[PDB]
Design a protein around this ligand. Structure first.
Ligand SMILES: N#Cc1cc2c(Oc3ccc(F)cc3OCCn3ccc(=O)[nH]c3=O)cc(F)cn2c1
Ligand SMILES: [Mg+2]
Lengths: 403, 539
């Protein structure tokens, strides 16, 4: 019944070091893995298996029971992209437009399908031991594992037959699957949507998290409206307009700069000439129109930049080509005392939105030190997938302009 | 009588690789006679067996002249990569004190575990005959060969399988597995402990593993992996420092590495000036001789660490040593350390005391999770209000686990803070700088709203240095409150990063100027856009 699978040519299996875990997380992983080997989901492996993939533990959506998360990012990249072939699932464009969408965890269904006998060695993971007092327990996955790229692709065949009645019974509801998460969109009332969600929940039991895409697209660039302007006010305005002039062609700053002529005090009020007031209006209407020639390219990578704005506010932009933002937004929100828990929640929200809009996760650029982020991000992660990221170490000047 | 046979681990060679085929180098007549005797007894024991002429693989054999040495260096180059045995060694401070603890080193350990039958062909070796007038006697290993790449990893996996049932059925005992040795500890009465030890030795004999007897078992103080383990405390083995020679670069590993090794229990150990020298081949700066003088004073009295007590809280306290050096102690009760350590500043052009403190916390946090499985409570030399002002206004996201302020100076402080809004009543300095890359000549200066001006000519400079110099001029020639307008994105990136010390001498002068001000507002404008104050013409 198994489906064959093999890595891409010229790529060996994953050999990723397991990072240290706290004692409470090691206990949770021991209890979980003891039950899984009894259920046949995993089996202990010997030393002939050099491959390893890290594993940690979280709690999802304020649920007491711990969940096991495996960072299959290396394996997924080394897993055949062709494992997606036959292209896995297409991305439905109607999912982003639906008034309401709900996400469910369908990962428990993946465990019923068996994994190929050859590929099991690549799903090897190690439960670590405190102080290296004893060798770590090593298992391998006999069944399809959650977080893998192939597991949704393989089950997509069964998934279509499992949900074929609910689809035919409810044609307006849209259904999408990314990793172990299933995204179902509706236009009905939230209470009706939630009760109607239990209809799909019952269907899943027989065979074996509310967001609303009312965000309203890329947020516009906005210039102040003042009756009196200081030298500092106009200096910030020209700097912002000169910045937006890389994104918008017609921006002109010559007439506003003429008001700043001479060496004046920053807090001195400058009356606006009619020519300059005209230039400000011509620039507003330019900013009211959309960005020119901005398209999505499924071959290219999505990039997500985040800027800490202070007081719980965070701004982000998604783009493939710089100055061609496919989406911009702000996250005001968490933990007011913890910057890192805020950023982690922000990274998850952005990734969730990016799955709904394009069906793939972006590569993040985080305003945080690598060593600080690597130490704490697992303590606040509540998602079943993991995106890629890098670390911005130079303060972006554009932080003010997105504020 | 049942021996409970050990199951072999399936072993293969690397893909696209064949077995080793090496020359049997000539041996003297005594060495040949010596290897015959050993192989006969080893073959009698079953560890090896004579092979026919069919085997096409060969690994060399030498004699060192009553000891056999089979060099599998080629087979190791071609055997598959085995799973890594636990790379780290257990740290003594993570150990929990037990009423008794017993060390058991398994003897003839690798030879007690068999080898995969399909791989025994690759372990072939030929003992040359005398005078080369007889075909050499060929042998193959039937057990884990000493020196083979997979012998350690296969032995560990086999040992862990055997130990699992005994451990589950004897919860009162705690077993630690490390290479060829097993360390058992219990809180039982000394009589029941020794009886349980004999049970484990019988279990290992059931599977064919030899153990030391009660009189042969070593007793504390144990000398293990460089430490000295005692029933109630722990320390490193006595320090070793080479005085010879008075001028030598051999201290590139000896002096610093041993001071690094002693840093886990000896607090206040510094290695910065001595590690600077490295920068098979040296002078000693006067600052490095003062480091060893304070080090030798720390190394004068022997110190000991305690064992971990899970019932008490885990505390970590950090101190600033100076020049990017940090020292920390981890303890549960006052004046009794579990371990100590140090943190070295990462190399950078501009740094901050608050940033270094955060990196030290993260470092200690990761070390503690490894050793004890939890994050310690921190006692830090920084005021609570300082951390709030820093983290709320920093452009990056930063976090420190639960901590409390300890007032042991030098306290970490913020040395300057820029205004978020322009200052009313303060002079507005428009600064600019430029240089010619061909001549390395440039100018820096400012113009203000009060009519104050200055332009300074400079030699051997760049555009980025002139733009920093112009800000420095504005700071020097301004009152206690000043507004500064620059077009230098490079200068803004340095100051918005908020350094307290820098590698550039010019930035440190700017820092020293900022510290003397009451309020500084730094504003940025685009260059060459017609802003009236930007006097790029003056350069
Ligand atoms: N040589 C050597 C050797 C022995 C051990 C080792 O022994 C222990 C085993 C189990 C246990 F529950 C505690 C143990 O030691 C606790 C601290 N301790 C030490 C000595 C003593 O006399 N009393 C005492 O409490 C553990 C380990 F990780 C590495 N080891 C190397
Ligand atoms: Mg300039």
């Amino acid at each position: 019944e198994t489906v064959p699978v093999k890595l891409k040519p010229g790529m060996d299996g994953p050999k990723v070091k397991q990072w240290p875990l706290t004692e409470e997380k090691i206990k949770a992983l021991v209890e979980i893995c003891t039950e899984m080997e009894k259920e046949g989901k995993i089996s202990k492996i010997g030393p002939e298996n050099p491959y390893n993939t890290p594993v940690f533990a979280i709690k999802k959506k304020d649920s007491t029971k711990w969940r096991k998360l495996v960072d299959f990012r290396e394996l997924n990249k080394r897993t055949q992209d062709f494992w997606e072939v036959q292209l896995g699932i297409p991305h439905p464009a109607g999912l982003k437009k639906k008034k309401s969408v709900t996400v469910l965890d369908v990962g428990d269904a993946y465990f019923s399908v068996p994994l190929d006998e050859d590929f099991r060695k690549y799903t090897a993971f190690t439960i670590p031991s405190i102080n290296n007092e004893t060798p770590g327990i090593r298992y391998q996955y006999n069944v399809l594992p959650q977080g893998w790229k192939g597991s949704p692709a393989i089950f997509q065949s069964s998934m279509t037959k499992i949900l074929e009645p609910f689809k035919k019974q409810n044609p307006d509801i849209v259904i999408y699957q990314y990793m172990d998460d299933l995204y179902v969109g509706s236009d009905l009332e939230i209470g009706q949507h939630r009760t109607k969600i239990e209809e799909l929940r019952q269907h899943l039991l027989r065979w074996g998290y509310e967001l609303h895409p009312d965000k309203w697209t890329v947020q516009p660039i906005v210039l102040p409206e003042k009756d009196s302007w200081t030298v500092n006010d106009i200096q910030k305005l020209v700097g912002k307009l000169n910045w937006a002039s890389q994104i918008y062609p017609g921006i002109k700053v010559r007439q506003l700069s003429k008001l700043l002529r001479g060496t004046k005090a920053l807090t001195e009020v400058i009356p606006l000439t009619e020519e300059a007031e005209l230039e400000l209006a011509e620039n507003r209407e330019i900013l009211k129109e959309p960005v020119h020639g901005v398209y999505y390219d499924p071959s290219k990578d999505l990039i997500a930049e985040i800027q800490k704005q202070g007081q719980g506010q965070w701004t982000y932009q998604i783009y493939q080509e710089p100055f061609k933002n496919l989406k911009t937004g702000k996250y005001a929100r968490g933990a007011h005392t913890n910057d890192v828990k805020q950023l982690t929640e922000a990274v998850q929200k952005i990734t969730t939105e990016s799955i709904v809009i394009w069906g793939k996760t972006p590569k993040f650029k985080l305003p945080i030190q690598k060593e600080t982020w690597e130490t704490w991000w697992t303590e606040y992660w509540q998602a079943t997938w993991i995106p890629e990221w890098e670390f911005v170490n130079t303060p972006p000047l554009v932080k003010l302009w997105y504020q | 009588v049942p021996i409970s046979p050990i199951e072999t681990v399936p072993v293969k060679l690397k893909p696209g690789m064949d077995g080793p085929k090496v020359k049997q180098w000539p041996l003297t007549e005594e060495k040949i006679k010596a290897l015959v005797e050993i192989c006969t007894e080893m073959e009698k024991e079953g560890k090896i067996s004579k092979i026919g002429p069919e085997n096409p693989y060969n690994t060399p054999v030498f004699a060192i002249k009553w000891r056999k040495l089979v060099d599998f260096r080629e087979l190791n180059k071609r055997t598959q990569d085995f799973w890594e045995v636990q790379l780290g060694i257990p740290h003594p401070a993570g150990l929990k004190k037990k009423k008794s603890a017993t060390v058991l080193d398994v003897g003839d350990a690798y030879f007690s575990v068999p080898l995969d039958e399909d791989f025994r062909k690759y372990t072939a070796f030929t003992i040359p005959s005398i005078n080369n007038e007889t075909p050499g006697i060929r042998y193959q290993y039937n057990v884990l060969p000493q020196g083979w790449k997979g012998s350690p990893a296969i032995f560990q996996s086999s040992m862990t399988k055997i130990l699992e049932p005994f451990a589950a059925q004897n919860p009162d005992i705690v077993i630690c597995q490390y290479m060829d040795d097993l360390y058992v500890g219990s809180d039982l009465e000394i009589g029941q402990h020794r009886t349980k030890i004999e049970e484990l030795r019988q279990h290992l004999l059931r599977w064919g593993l030899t153990t030391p007897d009660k009189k042969h078992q070593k007793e504390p103080p144990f000398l293990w992996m460089g430490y000295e383990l005692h029933p109630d405390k722990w320390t490193v083995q006595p320090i070793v420092l080479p005085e010879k020679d008075s001028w030598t670069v051999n201290d590139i590993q000896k002096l610093v590495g041993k001071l690094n090794w002693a840093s886990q229990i000896y607090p206040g150990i510094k290695v910065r000036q001595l590690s600077k020298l490295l920068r098979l081949t040296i002078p000693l700066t006067e600052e490095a001789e003062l480091e060893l003088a304070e080090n030798r004073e720390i190394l004068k009295e022997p110190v000991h660490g305690v064992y971990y007590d899970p019932s008490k809280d885990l505390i970590a306290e950090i101190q600033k040593q100076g020049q990017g050096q940090w020292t920390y102690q981890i303890y549960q009760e006052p004046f009794k350390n579990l371990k100590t350590g140090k943190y070295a500043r990462m190399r950078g052009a501009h740094t901050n005391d608050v940033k270094q403190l955060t990196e030290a916390v993260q470092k200690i946090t990761t070390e503690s999770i490894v050793i004890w499985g939890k994050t310690p409570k921190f006692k830090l030399p920084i005021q609570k209000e300082t951390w709030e002002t820093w983290w709320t206004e920093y452009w990056q996201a930063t976090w420190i686990p639960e901590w409390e302020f300890v007032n042991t100076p030098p306290l970490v402080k913020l040395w300057y803070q820029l205004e978020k809004e322009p200052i009313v009543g303060a002079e507005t300095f428009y600064v600019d700088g430029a240089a010619n890359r061909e001549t390395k000549l440039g100018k820096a200066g400012y113009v203000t709203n009060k009519g104050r001006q200055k332009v300074v000519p400079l030699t051997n400079t760049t555009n980025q240095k002139t733009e920093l110099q112009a800000i420095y001029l504005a700071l020097q020639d301004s009152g206690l409150e000043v507004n500064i307008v620059t077009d230098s994105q490079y200068a803004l990136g340095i100051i918005q990063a908020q350094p307290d010390k820098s590698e550039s001498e010019l930035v440190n002068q700017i820092i020293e100027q900022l510290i003397k001000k009451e309020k500084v507002y730094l504003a940025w404008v685009p260059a060459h856009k017609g802003i009236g104050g930007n006097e790029q013409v003056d350069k």
